[PDB]
Ligand binder design. Structure first.
Ligand SMILES: CO[C@@H]1[C@@H](n2cc(-c3ccc(Cl)c(F)c3F)nn2)[C@@H](O)[C@@H](CO)O[C@@H]1Cc1cn([C@@H]2COC[C@@H]2F)nn1
Length: 138
C-alpha cells in the first residue's frame, strides 16, 4: 500500500496491449478520484469519478492541452462505492483507452494526444487507499 497522490512512471510512454492495473479501496466519505495520464504538462487522459456532482454520481473524462481543459465525455454508469475495494484496468488500444472496473467494461476514450510514446507518467489521486499500481503487456 501507497499514500496518494502517487505518480507511476510509464517509461517510453504507453503502447497498444499495455494493461495498467490500479488496486485500492475507496475511502468511506469519498467525493472524487482521478487518474491523469500525462505527456509533460498535458493530460492525455483524465479519468475522474465524482461521487456528488449536483447530487449525482458521474464519470468525467477529458484532456488538458496547454493548461486548458477540452470537451468532457461523461458516463452515468458508476461502478465505485464508498468503502469498497476496486480494480481499475486501463487497456491501451491503437485508437483509444479502454477502461474496465472490477472486471466490467466501463468506457472507451479516443486518443486526442497522438504521441502515445510520450505519455510517460500516470498520476493517481483522490479519496482512495492505494494498494498497488502496475502494468503488463497482454
Ligand atoms: C474542478 O476541476 C476539474 C478538473 N480537476 C479535477 C482535479 C482533481 C484534483 C485532485 C484530485 Cl485528488 C482529484 F480527484 C481531482 F479530480 N483537478 N482538476 C477536471 O476534472 C476537469 C475535467 O474536465 O473538470 C474540472 C476543471 C474544468 C473543467 N472545465 C470545463 C467544463 O467543461 C469543459 C471544460 F472541461 N473547465 N475547468
Amino acid at each position: 500500500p501507497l499514500i496518494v497522490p502517487y505518480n507511476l512512471p510509464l517509461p517510453g510512454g504507453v503502447v497498444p496491449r499495455m494493461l495498467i492495473t490500479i488496486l485500492g479501496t475507496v475511502k468511506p466519505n469519498a467525493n472524487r478520484i482521478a487518474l491523469d495520464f500525462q505527456r509533460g504538462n498535458d493530460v492525455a487522459f483524465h479519468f475522474n469519478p465524482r461521487f456528488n456532482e449536483n447530487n449525482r454520481r458521474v464519470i468525467v473524462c477529458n484532456t488538458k492541452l496547454d493548461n486548458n481543459w477540452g470537451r468532457e465525455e461523461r458516463q452515468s454508469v458508476f461502478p465505485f462505492e464508498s468503502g469498497k475495494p476496486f480494480k481499475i484496468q486501463v487497456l491501451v488500444e491503437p485508437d483509444h483507452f479502454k477502461v474496465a472496473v472490477n472486471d466490467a467494461h466501463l468506457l472507451q476514450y479516443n486518443h486526442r494526444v497522438k504521441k502515445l510514446n510520450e505519455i510517460s507518467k500516470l498520476g493517481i489521486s483522490g479519496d482512495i487507499d492505494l494498494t498497488s499500481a502496475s502494468y503488463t503487456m497482454i
